[PDB]
Amino acid sequence: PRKAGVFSDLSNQELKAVHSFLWSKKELRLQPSSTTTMAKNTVFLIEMLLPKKYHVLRFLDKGERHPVREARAVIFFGDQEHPNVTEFAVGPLPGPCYMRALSPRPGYQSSWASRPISTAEYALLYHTLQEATKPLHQFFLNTTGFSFQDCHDRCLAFTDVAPRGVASGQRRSWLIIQRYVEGYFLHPTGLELLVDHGSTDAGHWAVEQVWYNGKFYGSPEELARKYADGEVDVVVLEDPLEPPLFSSHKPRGDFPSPIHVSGPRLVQPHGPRFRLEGNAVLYGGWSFAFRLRSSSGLQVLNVHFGGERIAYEVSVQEAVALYGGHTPAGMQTKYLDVGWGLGSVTHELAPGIDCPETATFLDTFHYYDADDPVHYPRALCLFEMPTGVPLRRHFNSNFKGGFNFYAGLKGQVLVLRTTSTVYNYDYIWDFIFYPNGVMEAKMHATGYVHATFYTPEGLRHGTRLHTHLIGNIHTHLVHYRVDLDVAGTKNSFQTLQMKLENITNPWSPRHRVVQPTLEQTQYSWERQAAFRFKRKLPKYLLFTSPQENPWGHKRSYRLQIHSMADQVLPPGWQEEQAITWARYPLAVTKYRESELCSSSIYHQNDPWDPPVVFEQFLHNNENIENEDLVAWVTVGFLHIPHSEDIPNTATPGNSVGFLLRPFNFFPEDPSLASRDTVIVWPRDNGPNYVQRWIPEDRDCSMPPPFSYNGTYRPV
Amino acid sequence: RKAGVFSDLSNQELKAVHSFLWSKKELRLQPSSTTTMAKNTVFLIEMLLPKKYHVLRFLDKGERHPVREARAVIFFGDQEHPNVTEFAVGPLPGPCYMRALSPRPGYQSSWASRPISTAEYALLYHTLQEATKPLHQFFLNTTGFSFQDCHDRCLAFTDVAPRGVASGQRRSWLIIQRYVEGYFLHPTGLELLVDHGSTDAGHWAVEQVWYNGKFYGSPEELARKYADGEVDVVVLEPPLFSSHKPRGDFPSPIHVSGPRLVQPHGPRFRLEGNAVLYGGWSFAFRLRSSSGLQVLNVHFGGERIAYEVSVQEAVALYGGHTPAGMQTKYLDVGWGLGSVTHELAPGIDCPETATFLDTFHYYDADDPVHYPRALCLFEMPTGVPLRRHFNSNFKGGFNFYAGLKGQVLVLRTTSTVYNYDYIWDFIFYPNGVMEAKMHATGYVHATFYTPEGLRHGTRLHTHLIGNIHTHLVHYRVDLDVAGTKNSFQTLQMKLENITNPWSPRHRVVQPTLEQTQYSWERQAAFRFKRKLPKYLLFTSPQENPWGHKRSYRLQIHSMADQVLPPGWQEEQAITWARYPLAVTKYRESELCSSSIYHQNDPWDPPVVFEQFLHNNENIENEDLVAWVTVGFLHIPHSEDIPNTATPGNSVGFLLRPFNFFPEDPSLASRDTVIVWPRDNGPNYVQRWIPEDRDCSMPPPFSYNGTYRPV
Ligand SMILES: *[C@@H]1O[C@H](CO)[C@@H](O[C@@H]2O[C@H](CO)[C@@H](O[C@@H]3O[C@H](CO)[C@@H](O)[C@H](O)[C@@H]3O)[C@H](O)[C@H]2NC(C)=O)[C@H](O)[C@H]1NC(C)=O
Ligand SMILES: *[C@@H]1O[C@H](CO)[C@@H](O[C@@H]2O[C@H](CO)[C@@H](O)[C@H](O)[C@H]2NC(C)=O)[C@H](O)[C@H]1NC(C)=O
Ligand SMILES: *[C@@H]1O[C@H](CO)[C@@H](O[C@@H]2O[C@H](CO)[C@@H](O)[C@H](O)[C@H]2NC(C)=O)[C@H](O)[C@H]1NC(C)=O
Ligand SMILES: *[C@@H]1O[C@H](CO)[C@@H](O[C@@H]2O[C@H](CO)[C@@H](O)[C@H](O)[C@H]2NC(C)=O)[C@H](O)[C@H]1NC(C)=O
Ligand SMILES: *[C@@H]1O[C@H](CO)[C@@H](O[C@@H]2O[C@H](CO)[C@@H](O)[C@H](O)[C@H]2NC(C)=O)[C@H](O)[C@H]1NC(C)=O
Ligand SMILES: *[C@@H]1O[C@H](CO)[C@@H](O[C@@H]2O[C@H](CO)[C@@H](O)[C@H](O)[C@H]2NC(C)=O)[C@H](O)[C@H]1NC(C)=O
Ligand SMILES: N=C(N)c1ccc(/N=N/Nc2ccc(C(=N)N)cc2)cc1
Ligand SMILES: N=C(N)c1ccc(/N=N/Nc2ccc(C(=N)N)cc2)cc1
Ligand SMILES: [Ca+2]
Ligand SMILES: [Ca+2]
Ligand SMILES: [Ca+2]
Ligand SMILES: [Ca+2]
Ligand SMILES: [Cu+2]
Ligand SMILES: [Cu+2]
């Protein structure tokens, strides 16, 4: 379990050591992230940098030395004539000595414009709006009762929209103005503002355009004039500050059948049946390591069942929400969450609500837009839960009023979970491990919708959810990397289909038999295994090893996709360059260290010219017979908002993902080693014999009282 | 309870119908168990639901309880021209009439169409025992088992349906097996075709024999060829591979029990008879002996959503290298899908905290039969919150955390006809979402291994091929969204390409919302070839407060496709499987998509779903019925030994409110917890129900395993 350490995230200590090394280089002229100027040099992100697979596998499988441990460090060089973002690999860990260039992109000139927004930048944007919108102060008070200047409890706020412009190198953002109340996401005022914030001198930033209640106005001063002159159709909003606010989670209404007591709960008197130690997990047949990459999110690594490898890596790669709208902000919105630190917004899981009270909760540290490493309490959880359906069961009737036996194995599953709450939405990320060698990836969407001011024109792009509220139509798309190494690194890909044959009936020659046969298709080249949404996706998608099981069949794992995704943007059109992976529910590539990721932190703010274009991995149409293969999976769903999304979208029916299932991999059902199986046998003239291999449990235990902290701070 | 109008017959009611019929001396009734096909016998008795018109007047307009009746299916085999006829028997209590149902003028295959029975199997065994006598030494040498003086080493058979090549035939391929633990997986390589059409079992014959890839004409011919050395013969303590007994070792052994649910405060749903209340939900249920589980009169928040959600048919369609294998198209309603609801094991099949319900069935029995723990009803945590939000202040703290623990109510039964166990769930979420689900487990339908079999299946063991097949299930979904009169619409996203209104040299290419209305049945019959829209909506004319039509959305979870060619022979029995979704106008003559007769006369069955669309009726503002096909291709693999497992082996659908309620309907729940920060103190944890950490023990495990008259 020390070996799983090669995959582990950086400790608080290691993050400090990397940060100190960087700070000791006086030439870098580094300032804290919190300093309120853009014209500074700052370390924006530090996270572990995974060593090459070749070296990790020699360490894991051939006894060779532990590879060098390094950190990725992203530095924003804003304090120079030509600002840029540059990345370094810092190592070794422990004892950093060097910083070497990482992911260089020579000849590209928009790296500064491509960079993620930061807390300092938001502060400066607030200052720009407080100044720029002075002409509108009375307009604000009259229409909303709230303001930007001299406010305390009745403040206007903004939600920014990305991407930020119409071409590579621009940083011009539409801002949706809202009333800062409980669940403020759902309180747009009808004003939206376009701000050019490209310059490293915030004094140059300007509101370049204004939209209010269906019209463009050019400047805050023009809107103020036209309002002063009685030429603006305004919407005066009611005061929001007994009954709860519509955007609140507070209970209201009554069910016809009163529920006064707590529902049923899990108890775990015997404690966990999995072994978690550091970032290593053992659970029955399973063995795996996990990590939480600050940039991109949850990964499980080096996944084995029964002592044989199934997958080197299964990871979240990108999460997108692609909008339409009647408002300029709405029509602009294409959120790419890795551009916001999808793996860094792993906020505190509430025991008994977010995970069972019996779960193991784990803390982590992130360094993402921070002055020091920040402690995130209960960022992850791991728990076993009964599924409520048996893994297998059979009643073997004697067809004479009794039975020969009943057999069953109670359903349990191991769940590794984190969340991501970048702003309005909360995504719940699960990897799930069944005792029979089946593993599942799942995402559940909850939290608040991205919403805009209601006008009649909005109904072509959304649904009216409240008096002044439209839920814009959009699609959620998530990309997973699935580096299966089925029984080893060298695999092939094949599909199975049912095809009818029409033959003479062998026992009645005047007749025909029209019946299913089993058809196998082999794939030799990447392009053949790149399935577009328009193409028919076969029902059996197999990743095979050349090794056979005892019955002469190739040992395989099967991929099963659960999605309602489809092609959203036209292939090849503008921002679609950033999400070319979304063309493919499934694509298979040959492994390469230069293609470890389908997205990046830079994609959100330069979608026109990003550093990774997934389609390019298919350009060379490589041979994929007996190679190290990587499956890439797109799952998703169209979300047309509806009134039941108020105040939050709920999880039921709102999940997507995929299963990996053994297919001729094992000689028989690998759950057979479980001792939880029960078989009941009849006895002549007596009570039945209940055969067990583990004693019946009726024991009891209690969880600790509920607590919740809510803060995340350096330690 | 008004829900009683939907309830199954009690033990008392079944006896009353049975006594009444037996008091009619001219029916010449004999018990199901009598060992002859030349008898008249009552095969099935179940409740016959009254017409929807009368039920809704009773429920909604305070009118009289409808007349309660039974369906009685009588096999008239003790006459020159045997047939099956069905009767409405009533009223209940105190039956005094017997009215014949559903005549079919010109149809001549009634008798052949009828289900198989225990007495018929007993006669088939006798036939095999006599007919295979010449093969006695062949059996002993090749298998060590036989049909005669065999004791603990007996051969058995698995029959296959349908039974012939045309309407009116009763000619069955029988797969010979060794009768050991999990005998399903022990084929010997012999298959026999028996003609058992005659009501005189003395006339039944083995008309054909297949052994290890060759046809042999008769048992006598196979015996002589064996003796003459002209047959390629296959001659056949850890647990048996077909046993569920544990073997092997995990790398990290588990020696203790896993987590379990406790319910110290009792159920949070109310069950009274067949009526359920849970949060916003009210509904009734029944277990129809012929066709299985139904939920009826489903309300959320005092408003109707569905009049009926019911299992209609469950099919498994095979290909194979052996005659039995290539013959097999199982239709489970022809075997009493709702009658094989065998005992649920507490803690394994349902949680130990579940409420288990008994039922009575009269299906191929001498008297009504008590089935213990036939169904269960339980609430369980889903392990994922129904909703949650962390409202960051983006400065190292929070404004609040809000969450609602996930719970669902599950109504469950099973069906084990023979080898497979189907687990049928209807699931109710606190936010007005209900789900139907079926999970497959148990033993696969398997045949004897030869190399030629690998074109139709997978080798699973030394002598065993798992044959390729598709499972298909049909559901009837009679949604009455806020009322009987509904329309059907779909929503799609479509891109527009416009001038960027704030940068005119550029374009905005973006999503718009496109609505499609449907006027005629045929427009709403979606074939597997056709693209299924992402939003399938059943709509009321009533609007919510935001001016959008109150609707429920259907979301299908399936891997099904077109299996048999439309129009070809047995496909006539499963025309519904052309459509993942079809929408019809409600009619009393179209309550079911299948029947107990479809299995044994699939060429000319009494209900052809496609015909329901022939008149292509208007579906604007009508009583609509949605019909849903879900299923999956199952290519067997070695992990299916000894049994297929449930993970990833489930299909079904969701019904989700869509602009039906003004806001999230779960907001009435008092389980919600909100955590608020406080100046210079601990956070305030706001609750509307006290925190509970109590634990209790469930009942100790018991299992009976018998199902008998009481
Ligand atoms: C992005 O910005 C970084 C940091 O400003 C650039 O790297 C820096 O490049 C400069 C000039 O090429 C190096 O500065 C010094 O230049 C003098 C020239 O007289 C030379 O004699 C010194 O030896 C030294 O190289 C500087 O070392 C280097 N800084 C770091 C931390 O590597 C980077 O080139 C910019 N990227 C792009 C693509 O423009
Ligand atoms: C399976 O093949 C058979 C034989 O080719 C087809 O049966 C023939 O169909 C045509 C009608 O289109 C008849 O005129 C012939 O008399 C039939 N021949 C025989 C030998 O029966 C049959 O249509 C095919 N079925 C399918 C579903 O493909
Ligand atoms: C959240 O967690 C922090 C860290 O444990 C708590 O900070 C502690 O506050 C208590 C006061 O009860 C002191 O005893 C400790 O010295 C504090 N430690 C640090 C490192 O600050 C904090 O109180 C918790 N906040 C809430 C709202 O529950
Ligand atoms: C099926 O057989 C039944 C019972 O033998 C027939 O029903 C009888 O029909 C005769 C003459 O039509 C009536 O006088 C009897 O009263 C009927 N008996 C009962 C119990 O209903 C019936 O005609 C046959 N059905 C068909 C389609 O031939
Ligand atoms: C959206 O519409 C615009 C305008 O019709 C299309 O852009 C034109 O494309 C042609 C051929 O590529 C060019 O020669 C014209 O100069 C373009 N016109 C303008 C005004 O830009 C555009 O291709 C369409 N985009 C999509 C994805 O359909
Ligand atoms: C299964 O259930 C039946 C019904 O309760 C049990 O039979 C009863 O057993 C008691 C105790 O011996 C007898 O006194 C009664 O006469 C039986 N009642 C009836 C109605 O038959 C039976 O023992 C149970 N079987 C098993 C194996 O647990
Ligand atoms: N899903 C997303 N990527 C996403 C959606 C909306 C969004 N808007 N954020 N706006 C936003 C505005 C101000 C602050 C601040 N005071 N620190 C923080 C965030 C940011 C990201
Ligand atoms: N899925 C099905 N419908 C189905 C599958 C297989 C099947 N075969 N049954 N064989 C079978 C044989 C003998 C008996 C008897 N001794 N009573 C009962 C059943 C019957 C039905
Ligand atoms: Ca390639
Ligand atoms: Ca690989
Ligand atoms: Ca019709
Ligand atoms: Ca209806
Ligand atoms: Cu959404
Ligand atoms: Cu199957």
UniProtKB/Swiss-Prot annotation, chain A:
Record localization: Secreted, Extracellular space; Cell membrane
Free-text tissue specificity from the UniProt record: Widely expressed with higher expression in placenta and kidney.
Post-translational modification: N-glycosylated.
Reactions performed catalytically: histamine + O2 + H2O = imidazole-4-acetaldehyde + H2O2 + NH4(+); N(tau)-methylhistamine + O2 + H2O = 1-methylimidazole-4-acetaldehyde + H2O2 + NH4(+); putrescine + O2 + H2O = 4-aminobutanal + H2O2 + NH4(+); cadaverine + O2 + H2O = 5-aminopentanal + H2O2 + NH4(+)
Stored InterPro entries: Cu_Am_Ox_Cu-bd (IPR049947), Cu_Am_ox_TPQ-bd (IPR049948), Cu_amine_oxidase (IPR000269), Cu_amine_oxidase_C (IPR015798), Cu_amine_oxidase_C_sf (IPR036460), Cu_amine_oxidase_N-reg (IPR016182), Cu_amine_oxidase_N2 (IPR015800), Cu_amine_oxidase_N3 (IPR015802)
Cofactor(s) it depends on: Cu(2+); Ca(2+); L-topaquinone
Pfam families per the UniProt record, alphabetical: Cu_amine_oxid, Cu_amine_oxidN2, Cu_amine_oxidN3
Cofactor binding mode and count: Binds 1 copper ion per subunit. Binds 2 calcium ions per subunit.
GO MF, one annotated term: diamine oxidase activity
pH dependence, entry free text: Optimum pH is 7.2.
Residue numbers annotated as active site: D337, Y425
Residues at which Ca(2+) 1 binds: D483, L484, D485, D628, L629
Record GO biological process: putrescine metabolic process
Sites where a glycan is attached: N84, N142, N502, N709
Record note on quaternary structure: Homodimer; disulfide-linked.
Matching PANTHER family: AMILORIDE-SENSITIVE AMINE OXIDASE [COPPER-CONTAINING] (PTHR10638:SF3), COPPER AMINE OXIDASE (PTHR10638)
Family: Belongs to the copper/topaquinone oxidase family.
Role according to the record: Catalyzes the oxidative deamination of primary amines to the corresponding aldehydes with the concomitant production of hydrogen peroxide and ammonia. Its preferred substrates are the diamines histamine and 1-methylhistamine and it could therefore play a role in allergic and immune responses. Has a broad specificity for diamines and can also act on cadaverine and putrescine, two products of amino acid catabolism. It could also act on polyamines, like spermidine and spermine though less efficiently, and regulate various biological processes.
The protein, known as: Diamine oxidase [copper-containing]
Organism, scientific name: Homo sapiens
Gene behind this protein: AOC1
